[PDB]
Amino acid sequence: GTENLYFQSMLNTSGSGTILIDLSPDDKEFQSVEEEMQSTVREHRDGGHAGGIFNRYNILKIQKVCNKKLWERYTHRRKEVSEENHNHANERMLFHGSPFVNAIIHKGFDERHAYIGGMFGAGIYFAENSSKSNQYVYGIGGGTGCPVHKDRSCYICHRQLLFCRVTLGKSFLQFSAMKMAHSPPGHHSVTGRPSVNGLALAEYVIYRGEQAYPEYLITYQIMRPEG
Ligand SMILES: CS(=O)(=O)c1ccc(-c2nnc(/C=C/c3nnc(-c4ccc(C#N)cc4)o3)n2-c2ccccc2Cl)nc1
Ligand SMILES: NC(=O)c1cccnc1
Ligand SMILES: [Zn+2]
């Protein structure tokens, strides 16, 4: 596509203030995000042990997260990374899943709530594939599942993902485990690459919460296959 759907300028809400904007399914912005959500689903190695067993989702809502402070903090970081990387910010849309969605869209991503015991250390993790971020909606490795039924493969409870503007800058390409506290020298993010005897699907790690904007809030639920 050659239309500017994902990377439009944000305008002053008022603001306090996180305001959600309801996108109608007839809008091409809704449809693009929906299709990106649906088409990037892969068959996982766990057998769906973490994210659940599915092929597609039931997209219920796609809202656009509008926050003045979070925006004028992302742009400042983006401009900074750009200047340190030959005017190339390396911005792209990536999925994100965590139990902290409500906090992320009100306060922004927060590195100080990282993990350090992750594959690439104390960073905030993003994915090309929507079904990968889905494995982290109810916590690391799926956690105990949905709060109501304790089911990691629940088709009843509604879930939320984030489709985010991510500034990658000069990304450090890694195959093996490399537990970082910050982005490696000269770089601004880490890219986990697919490889045999390693990762099956890619992943992208930043170490500054200001380096990502939670543009799209997706309310969905995984769908039972037939059968
Ligand atoms: C299993 S793994 O691949 O290594 C892996 C590791 C880490 C992540 C990963 N990537 N991003 C996050 C969380 C980001 C975040 N931003 N703000 C918050 C927050 C805000 C307020 C409060 C309060 N009160 C708590 C948190 O969180 N996480 C994460 C961190 C700890 C626990 C679970 C997860 Cl998903 N994703 C995957
Ligand atoms: N929490 C996530 O969305 C995520 C994305 C990629 C890898 N690990 C976790
Ligand atoms: Zn449930």
| Residue of the CA atom closest to atom 4 of ligand 1 | 118
Question: What is the Å distance from ligand 2's center to 126 Cα?
Answer: 5
Ligand 1 site, residue 105, Cβ cutoff 6 A: no
DSSP 172: E
Could you tell me which CATH number the domain at 1-227 has?
A: 3.90.228.10
Question: What is the Å distance from ligand 1's center to 4 Cα?
Answer: 30
- What is the rounded distance in angstroms from the CA atom of residue 142 to the CA atom of residue 158? 15
CB atoms within 10 A of CB 227: 3
- What is the rounded distance in angstroms from the CA atom of residue 28 to the CA atom of residue 26? 6
- What is the rounded distance in angstroms from the CA atom of residue 214 to the CA atom of residue 70? 9
Query: Is 149 flagged in the annotation as binding?
Result: yes
Contacts of 107 (CB under 8 A, 6+ apart): 70
- What is the rounded distance in angstroms from the CA atom of residue 174 to the CA atom of residue 203? 10
| Residue of the CA atom closest to atom 9 of ligand 2 | 125
**According to the entry, how was the structure determined?**
X-ray
- What is the rounded distance in angstroms from the CA atom of residue 188 to the CA atom of residue 171? 6
- Burial profile 7-42: b = 16 or more Cβ within 10 angstroms, e = fewer: eeebeeeeeeebeeeebeeeeebbbbbbebbeebbe
DSSP letters of 124-169?
Answer: EEEBSSHHHHGGGTTSGGGTT-STTT--TT-SSS-EEEEEEEEE--
Query: How many residues are present in the chain?
Result: 227
| CA-to-CA separations, 87 to 77, 78, 186, in angstroms, rounded | 13, 10, 15
Q: Phi and psi at residue 101, in whole multiples of 5°?
A: -50, -45
Ligand 1 site, residue 138, Cβ cutoff 6 A: no
**What residue type is assigned to position 79 of the chain?**
K
Burial class (CB in 10 A: 0-12, 13-18, 19+), 159: buried
Q: Of ligand 1's atoms, which has the minimum distance to the CA of residue 136?
A: 35
- What is the rounded distance in angstroms from the CA atom of residue 28 to the CA atom of residue 145? 33
Please give the resolution of this entry in Å, rounded to 1 decimal.
Answer: 2.8
Beta strands across the sheet bearing 18-22 = 18-22, 61-67, 212-220, 159-167, 91-96
Question: What is the Å distance from ligand 3's center to 156 Cα?
Answer: 5
- Burial profile 88-126: b = 16 or more Cβ within 10 angstroms, e = fewer: ebbbebbbbbbeebeebbeebbebeebeeebbbbbbbbb
Question: What is the Å distance from ligand 1's center to 26 Cα?
Answer: 33
Return the SS3 of 173: strand
Query: Is 164 flagged in the annotation as binding?
Result: no
Q: Two tokens at 214?
A: 């939670």
Ligand 1 site, residue 180, Cβ cutoff 6 A: no
Measured torsion, CA atoms of residues 130, 135, 140, 145, in degrees rounded to the nearest 10: 140
Query: Is 146 flagged in the annotation as binding?
Result: yes
Q: Is the dihedral of CA 182, 187, 188, 192 positive or negative?
A: negative
Pocket test for ligand 1, best of 18, 70, 96, 100 (most atoms within 8 A of CB): 100
Query: Is 154 flagged in the annotation as binding?
Result: yes
